[PDB]
Amino acid sequence: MREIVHIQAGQCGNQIGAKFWEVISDEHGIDPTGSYHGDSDLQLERINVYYNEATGNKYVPRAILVDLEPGTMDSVRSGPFGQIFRPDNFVFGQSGAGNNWAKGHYTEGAELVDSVLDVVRKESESCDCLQGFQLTHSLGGGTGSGMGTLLISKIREEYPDRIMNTFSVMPSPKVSDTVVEPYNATLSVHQLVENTDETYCIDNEALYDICFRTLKLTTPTYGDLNHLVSATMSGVTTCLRFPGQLNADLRKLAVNMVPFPRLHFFMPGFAPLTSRGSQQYRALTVPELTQQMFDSKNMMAACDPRHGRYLTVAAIFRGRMSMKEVDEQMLNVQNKNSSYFVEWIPNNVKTAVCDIPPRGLKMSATFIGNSTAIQELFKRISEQFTAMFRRKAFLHWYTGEGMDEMEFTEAESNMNDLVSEYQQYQDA
Amino acid sequence: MRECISIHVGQAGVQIGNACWELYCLEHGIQPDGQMPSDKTIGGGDDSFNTFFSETGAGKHVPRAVFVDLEPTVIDEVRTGTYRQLFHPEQLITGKEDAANNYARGHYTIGKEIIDLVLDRIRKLADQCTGLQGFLVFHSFGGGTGSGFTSLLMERLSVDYGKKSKLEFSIYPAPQVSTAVVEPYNSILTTHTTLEHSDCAFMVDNEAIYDICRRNLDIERPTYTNLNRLISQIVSSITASLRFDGALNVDLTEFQTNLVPYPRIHFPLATYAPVISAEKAYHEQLSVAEITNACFEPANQMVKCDPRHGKYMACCLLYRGDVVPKDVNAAIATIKTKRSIQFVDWCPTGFKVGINYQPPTVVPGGDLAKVQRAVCMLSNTTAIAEAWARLDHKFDLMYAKRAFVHWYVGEGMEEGEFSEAREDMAALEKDYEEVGVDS
Amino acid sequence: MEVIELNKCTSGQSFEVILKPPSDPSLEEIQKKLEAAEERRKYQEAELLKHLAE
Amino acid sequence: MYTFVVRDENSSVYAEVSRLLLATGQWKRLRKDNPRFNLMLGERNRLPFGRLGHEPGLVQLVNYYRGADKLCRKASLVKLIKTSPELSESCTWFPESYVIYPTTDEREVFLAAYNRGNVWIAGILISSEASELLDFIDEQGQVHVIQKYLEKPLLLEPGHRKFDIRSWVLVDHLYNIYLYREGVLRTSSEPYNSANFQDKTCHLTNHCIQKEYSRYEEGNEMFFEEFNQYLMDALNTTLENSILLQIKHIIRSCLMCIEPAISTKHLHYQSFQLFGFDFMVDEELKVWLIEVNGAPACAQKLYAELCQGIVDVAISSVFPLATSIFIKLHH
Numbered sequence A: 001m002r003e004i005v006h007i008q009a010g011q012c013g014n015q016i017g018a019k020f021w022e023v024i025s026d027e028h029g030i031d032p033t034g035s036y037h038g039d040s041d042l043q044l045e046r047i048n049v050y051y052n053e054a055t056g057n058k059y060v061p062r063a064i065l066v067d068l069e070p071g072t073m074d075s076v077r078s079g080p081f082g083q084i085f086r087p088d089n090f091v092f093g094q095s096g097a098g099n100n101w102a103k104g105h106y107t108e109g110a111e112l113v114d115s116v117l118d119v120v121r122k123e124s125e126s127c128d129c130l131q132g133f134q135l136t137h138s139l140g141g142g143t144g145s146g147m148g149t150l151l152i153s154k155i156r157e158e159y160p161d162r163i164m165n166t167f168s169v170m171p172s173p174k175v176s177d178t179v180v181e182p183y184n185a186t187l188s189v190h191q192l193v194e195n196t197d198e199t200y201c202i203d204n205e206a207l208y209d210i211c212f213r214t215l216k217l218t219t220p221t222y223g224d225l226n227h228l229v230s231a232t233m234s235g236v237t238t239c240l241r242f243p244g245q246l247n248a249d250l251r252k253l254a255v256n257m258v259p260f261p262r263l264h265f266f267m268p269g270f271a272p273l274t275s276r277g278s279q280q281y282r283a284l285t286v287p288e289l290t291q292q293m294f295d296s297k298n299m300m301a302a303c304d305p306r307h308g309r310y311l312t313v314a315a316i317f318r319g320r321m322s323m324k325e326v327d328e329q330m331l332n333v334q335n336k337n338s339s340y341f342v343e344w345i346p347n348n349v350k351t352a353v354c355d356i357p358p359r360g361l362k363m364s365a366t367f368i369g370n371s372t373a374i375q376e377l378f379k380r381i382s383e384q385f386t387a388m389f390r391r392k393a394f395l396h397w398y399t400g401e402g403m404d405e406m407e408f409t410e411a412e413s414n415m416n417d418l419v420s421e422y423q424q425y426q427d428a
Numbered sequence B: 001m002r003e004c005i006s007i008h009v010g011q012a013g014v015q016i017g018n019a020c021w022e023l024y025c026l027e028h029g030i031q032p033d034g035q036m037p038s039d040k041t042i043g044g045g046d047d048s049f050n051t052f053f054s055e056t057g058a059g060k061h062v063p064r065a066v067f068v069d070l071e072p073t074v075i076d077e078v079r080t081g082t083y084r085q086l087f088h089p090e091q092l093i094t095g096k097e098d099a100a101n102n103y104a105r106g107h108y109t110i111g112k113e114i115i116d117l118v119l120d121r122i123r124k125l126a127d128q129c130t131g132l133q134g135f136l137v138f139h140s141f142g143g144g145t146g147s148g149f150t151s152l153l154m155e156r157l158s159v160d161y162g163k164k165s166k167l168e169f170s171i172y173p174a175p176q177v178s179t180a181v182v183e184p185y186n187s188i189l190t191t192h193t194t195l196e197h198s199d200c201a202f203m204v205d206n207e208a209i210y211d212i213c214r215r216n217l218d219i220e221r222p223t224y225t226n227l228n229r230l231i232s233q234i235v236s237s238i239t240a241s242l243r244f245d246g247a248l249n250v251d252l253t254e255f256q257t258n259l260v261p262y263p264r265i266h267f268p269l270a271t272y273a274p275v276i277s278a279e280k281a282y283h284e285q286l287s288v289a290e291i292t293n294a295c296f297e298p299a300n301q302m303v304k305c306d307p308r309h310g311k312y313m314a315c316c317l318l319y320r321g322d323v324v325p326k327d328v329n330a331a332i333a334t335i336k337t338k339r340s341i342q343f344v345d346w347c348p349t350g351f352k353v354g355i356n357y358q359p360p361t362v363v364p365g366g367d368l369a370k371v372q373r374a375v376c377m378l379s380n381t382t383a384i385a386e387a388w389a390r391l392d393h394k395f396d397l398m399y400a401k402r403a404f405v406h407w408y409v410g411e412g413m414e415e416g417e418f419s420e421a422r423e424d425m426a427a428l429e430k431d432y433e434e435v436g437v438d439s
Numbered sequence C: 001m002e003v004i005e006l007n008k009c010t011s012g013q014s015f016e017v018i019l020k021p022p023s024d025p026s027l028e029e030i031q032k033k034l035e036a037a038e039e040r041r042k043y044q045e046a047e048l049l050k051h052l053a054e
Numbered sequence D: 001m002y003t004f005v006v007r008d009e010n011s012s013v014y015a016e017v018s019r020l021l022l023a024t025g026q027w028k029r030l031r032k033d034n035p036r037f038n039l040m041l042g043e044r045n046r047l048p049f050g051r052l053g054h055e056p057g058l059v060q061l062v063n064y065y066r067g068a069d070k071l072c073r074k075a076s077l078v079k080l081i082k083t084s085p086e087l088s089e090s091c092t093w094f095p096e097s098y099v100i101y102p103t104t105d106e107r108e109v110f111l112a113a114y115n116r117g118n119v120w121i122a123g124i125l126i127s128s129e130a131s132e133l134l135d136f137i138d139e140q141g142q143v144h145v146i147q148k149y150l151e152k153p154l155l156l157e158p159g160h161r162k163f164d165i166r167s168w169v170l171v172d173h174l175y176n177i178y179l180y181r182e183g184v185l186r187t188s189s190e191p192y193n194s195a196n197f198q199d200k201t202c203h204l205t206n207h208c209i210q211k212e213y214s215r216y217e218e219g220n221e222m223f224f225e226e227f228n229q230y231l232m233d234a235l236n237t238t239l240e241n242s243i244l245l246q247i248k249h250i251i252r253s254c255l256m257c258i259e260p261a262i263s264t265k266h267l268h269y270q271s272f273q274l275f276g277f278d279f280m281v282d283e284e285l286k287v288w289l290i291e292v293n294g295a296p297a298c299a300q301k302l303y304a305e306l307c308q309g310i311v312d313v314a315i316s317s318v319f320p321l322a323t324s325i326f327i328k329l330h331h
Ligand SMILES: Nc1nc2c(ncn2[C@@H]2O[C@H](COP(=O)(O)OP(=O)(O)OP(=O)(O)O)[C@@H](O)[C@H]2O)c(=O)[nH]1
Pocket: B009, B010, B011, B012, B013, B015, B016, B069, B070, B071, B098, B099, B100, B101, B102, B106, B139, B140, B141, B142, B143, B144, B145, B146, B147, B171, B177, B178, B179, B180, B206, B224, B225, B227, B228
């Protein structure tokens, strides 16, 4: 089978990563001990894309837990599924990285990295058909931001021809109050432009706006955010984990979503949105699922889709429903909003249907948009960066790790380019 | 008796393969284990149906075919389904990584890596062949393997078997079932490279099969099974003449003599009827007149296009069931007046007709009802260029922006093979215009 | 309006009806072309590893 | 909602159509290259019929009939009448015509009937002599046609001038033949003078060449209520009986002749299209046809109505929303 090696690094990285695992582990019927207890053989039929076979009919996540501080390791090991991970697959330091990209990438992350790469080799070396890696991390901190993008550079150098996939959580001052996050984010985006094939942009602005407004969560928590990040992750990976036609491996996805190498930043979207513990009373009708998933209130990146144009788009439907109707409804979308799709990529919307629904939903949809409107997100970060880089403010925290102003100027220029690049393709 | 090798390539060709090879088995009365009580030539015989099957001293009849996907998921269903006993492990070739809907990947990267094993595996079949006449190649245009390996294989075949015929059954891309947006890229690329190595191409447009399944068989959202079963009927009409006693279309050279005056215009349009729902409460049987007329309605063709705006260079009527020339000529006579059917001057206005008395065989529990008679027409009309014009337009919209080009280039393909492939297509569309579309 | 070459057998009949009369490369060059592609494909990866080693 | 693109920015006529459609909030205009349209107001030349009727979810309509050019190109029309058994030489409302080429050729066959009063026509060259005429086109470098110039035209009075009848015919997707009730005579301002075959002024009623010289009618357009009156006051007849009966007969005969070759009844896209037929009344009140016009413009007076009628019968018939100005020619 085509195997995927999952790496999760830093606080954010390690917590959405654990959540992802417990969600798909349920989906696939694996219990918090690694043993299959489902019905449908559709659960097991592709189980080895994300799990590993051990004697006992036991299934080990092909996951590697990385952090520069022991905190998060111990939390996940003492989480619900804390016990189903290869325990040598926990790589962790002591110092921490103190919300500093330069410490994750350059100084602290250096010591620890080779120990991470050993487990990545040991995992990769026992793959019949490694298709690539998927890393979970945040971009506003120091370990996942700084060490994550270092590992990505080191992984591409040993595996230059396997696919590199990241779920990257973007910082928002609605949820955080560390002043240097715009620095860490720009340094990380600069890396992601050059070294990943597909990046999902989980924006904490969008995650907060959904939770606070839409779901009316008066005092939201990362567990609430991560609830949206959990469902999305399950959504966009359905096509890798069950049998199907479309976007069923990381390469085939990329060839369908990425019309130019740098424009590989994806805008996710889920319907229905749900507060956890939300008693589900009614199913969404297929036209409801369709309308919502394309709606801006439903994106995981705080960008106005009507402010740009869709380059490519993938729609995943789950639960028992009518392909005749999904197909009818997906057509109507493109037909009533046809200017919002570039006319110079014909038929740029591919739609999959999985019969197996997610947990607690009878009906869901997951949207993956490659829209030029995501320039809005990089622009948001870029303006915060500029505001304080133009006065070289807070730069000492970085130059004292051996970084140099020139690097900040580069990362900023590559991102400003990424934005102008997305804009040129908005005009055809 | 002269054998033909079938080569099924990529997911589409391989799934269409079992669709045919299953039907073939039902028609010749062969069982899922190669047994054919009806053959009394136990271990051989040069009967007409040996062209497609060879015989095993134990009495198994084994298709003269080889399947080959660059990934194992599909062919594994052939080495496990009902007809697993029927094929031979060495004729089901598989690789590990597929071609990610990337022509350049399947032609160059991975292509090279498994061409020789395929060519070898193929020569194996050419040896137990007293007078091999050529090959039928089943593939899709849009996928990685289907487009990029096939064109690779088509060039080794023109090298390894120069005096041999090659026919194509080729699946033209439609978005209602297409799983890639680069499909026009792969289609133009593989058409170009393959154009000089194929003696005759039958393009089934998925869009056409799909509406035929929707309108005529009441099937809400056709699956590949429905599509592939219908394609096996049409394919079986095109090949019936090579496996049954007849005088028309007896060997593959005859196909290009009958359908293909010019070598580049070698894409005959296939049109089939009647297509009825097995579940239809009652159907008043259609007549020779009624089925033959149906052959001029665009809604039965394997390619939606208007042959009234275009000229003909050949026509063949392949009837299966209860037909006699009196009715056939009678019907020709009468549609000749009602319809617009102009041939090109340097060609006679005329029809070649063939009748197999045994009505069409239907897969039990399939979607198609048994019918007392059926016809497949094989017109070569310039009107099929419509399909090239629209595919070439999609190519142009994307290549103007260079969308996706880097995926092919990154595999080694040079940007120019895009423009030289497309420019050849413009030549193709130009010839179709010269020939037809004058008066 | 003219039936030609009527041929009959127990399987069926065959005939022509006219209504109006008329008014390559080499295994060498193949290999020369596949290899030019891995040379480009391997050069690209070289430059990429080269960057990454910087 | 419905969507249309526009691809002939020179259509006085379908500029009105798009203006009306938009002015309903029920029609948006996409960009010409956006394929996701219901209606294509379609270009005049090399319109890409091959590409129509393939978008799922969309019903598509185009405002031309592929192959209607046979009716609408002078050399083709001729061959159409001459060959089609429905028309043939039995045809008695088409001036005697042949196709000629500079430097299937009917040049010999033309003189064949040229014998002994004989005036013909080819701006363009009118002359009663084969020479100067045949060689005019024989140099011209564009295939043209030789048609018997009608020597005894019905001439209006006061004036003694010739006119020209334009009827607008709309053919929808069902192949209903609508005839717009209001037509126009393209009258001549200079009294029609025999022996002036090279005058090209009184002899030619082309709205252009008449605006060069021109009086009685606003821009040389006489409409039907006036022409009916004159036909009654003199002649003692109706426009209906004397002329329009022949006209309805010629429109029906021409359009149905080709119906099997351009009907879109069972086709993956639908066509409608507006034709302008050009007629000649003669001394004995016998109607003659000359041009069928594939992309006709409309008399300025009548744009408001015809263009709304196109939207009504031809476009809204297919894409609905939420007395009749036409005369359906029954067949
Ligand atoms: N009509 C029909 N089309 C099919 C069928 N299977 C696949 N296709 C089409 O074939 C296209 C790809 O063809 P291939 O090149 O053979 O793809 P493949 O067989 O999976 O091989 P790879 O591309 O290398 O993965 C798809 O886009 C489908 O639209 C089928 O069973 N019936």
